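Here we describe the complex-level prediction in full. Unlike the single-chain runs in Section 2.1, the three entities below were treated as one system.
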Amino acid sequence: KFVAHAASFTIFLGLLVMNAAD
Amino acid sequence: SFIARFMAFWHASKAQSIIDWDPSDPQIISEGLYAIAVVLSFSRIAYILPANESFGPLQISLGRTVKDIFKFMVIFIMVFVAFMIGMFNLYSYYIGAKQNEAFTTVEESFKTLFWAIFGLSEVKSVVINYNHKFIENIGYVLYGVYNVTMVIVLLNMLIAMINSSFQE
Amino acid sequence: MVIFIMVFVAFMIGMFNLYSYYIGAKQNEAFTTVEESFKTLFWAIFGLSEVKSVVINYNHKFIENIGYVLYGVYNVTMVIVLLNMLIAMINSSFQE
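The structure predicted for the assembly as a whole is:
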């Protein structure tokens, strides 16, 4: 649950960066 | 932020639905708050940071140092306001004189007086395009004594007292 | 340096995301491209950046103020907190 929760948080950040880039 | 973007989408969708740089416009409010939400959400990783060995004690001591510097922030902003009301009260009649901006409105003088802590303010802010050399000199002495007293005294207070906090 | 660059990226993506549409507005350069905003945000640690980077040639005073608050709070938080962390913890490292 910890690795999954943390990882999905990181893909939230990644989608933030890719939404910002273009 | 998403409420704002939905409102813009509804107004514009009603507009281009009817056919077949606004200063207060909500879309710039959306782009505006969306950045703050980006910063906070990026700064929410301190919840899952402490699990690791080498990063745990670091994360733990950060909070202690912040809790230590709050009670210094109190007197810090006391001195800040004490000088700021004096300077705004001094230059308030000169709005069309001094070369560079600010030191005029309350919210505009709070800026140049805040950025002097980091050294990004300019000394040329104190000069006047009239003569009135007495008021100019009063500005030099008040601004200088502000810098000396608050920066030089409060920094040594912070460092000396925080080392005092570690040793015990 | 780990947490240092964490905070650095956290503020940098926010600022680049904020000013990305203004490329033809603000007086001085950068705060626009990723690699170009990383510069003015890196040189603020050493005080060689300019505050005038936050002004806009449109009006839009709300976004300008958001830039002032984000940039300022960046400077305060990361510089003033992380420096005292470094010194206090390194003296802690010597004494033991």
